[PDB]
Amino acid sequence: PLIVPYNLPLPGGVVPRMLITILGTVKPNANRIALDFQRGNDVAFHFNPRFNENNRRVIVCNTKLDNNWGREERQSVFPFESGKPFKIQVLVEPDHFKVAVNDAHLLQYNHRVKKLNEISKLGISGDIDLTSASYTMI
Ligand SMILES: OC[C@H]1O[C@@H](S[C@@H]2O[C@H](CO)[C@@H](O)[C@H](O)[C@H]2O)[C@H](O)[C@@H](n2cc(-c3ccccc3F)nn2)[C@H]1O
């Protein structure tokens, strides 16, 4: 029952072995969700489930630098369902973010922003009831 959009500070940025967990429930008739791992105004890793892009469900990932989006990476495996509880786990690995949803691997996103210790905030937005957002080292 956290307020959305939600800003989770990531003190000292991210680092390999850091696991970020987001628990929530998708709203009925959801349109979109976004996680934005931010380095100041830049978005190192945007993770964006879209429930209706041309009547298809797709996950779009990208990076925003100096207010410009780059090349999208798209994943049609789509583990979310309107109305249902989810867990997103984002594990920082040395050369990529590794994302699992509901304990099943979903995608990896290679690091474009390389100053990992400056990726100091996670924004959580869109059509969810947000239960919790936290991090730990594994
Ligand atoms: O690349 C990734 C970006 O994509 C564009 S749309 C893109 O536009 C291109 C140019 O026309 C096309 O070339 C390309 O096909 C098409 O995907 C989105 O607006 C961006 N966004 C989403 C959101 C957001 C806000 C609130 C809640 C959830 C959210 F997700 N805030 N910003 C971002 O997701």
Curated annotation (Swiss-Prot):
GO terms for biological process: eosinophil chemotaxis; epithelial cell differentiation; innate immune response; macrophage chemotaxis; monocyte chemotaxis; mononuclear cell migration; mRNA processing; negative regulation of endocytosis. Transmembrane segments: none annotated. Coiled coil: none annotated. GO terms for molecular function: carbohydrate binding; chemoattractant activity; disaccharide binding; IgE binding; laminin binding; molecular condensate scaffold activity; protein phosphatase binding; protein phosphatase inhibitor activity. A motif (Nuclear export signal) lies at residues 114-129. A major expression is found in the colonic epithelium. It is also abundant in the activated macrophages. Expressed in fetal membranes. Its main location: cytoplasm. The modification Phosphoserine is found at S76. Keywords: Acetylation, Cytoplasm, Differentiation, Disulfide bond, IgE-binding protein, Immunity, Innate immunity, Lectin, mRNA processing, mRNA splicing, Nucleus, Phosphoprotein, Repeat, Secreted, Spliceosome. A beta-D-galactoside binds at W69, G70, R71, E72, E73, R74, Q75. It is found in: Cytoplasm; Nucleus; Secreted. Probably forms homo- or heterodimers. Interacts with DMBT1. Interacts with CD6 and ALCAM. Forms a complex with the ITGA3, ITGB1 and CSPG4. Interacts with LGALS3BP, LYPD3, ZFTRAF1 and UACA. Interacts with TRIM16; this interaction mediates autophagy of damage endomembranes. Interacts with cargo receptor TMED10; the interaction mediates the translocation from the cytoplasm into the ERGIC (endoplasmic reticulum-Golgi intermediate compartment) and thereby secretion. This is Galectin-3. The gene is LGALS3.
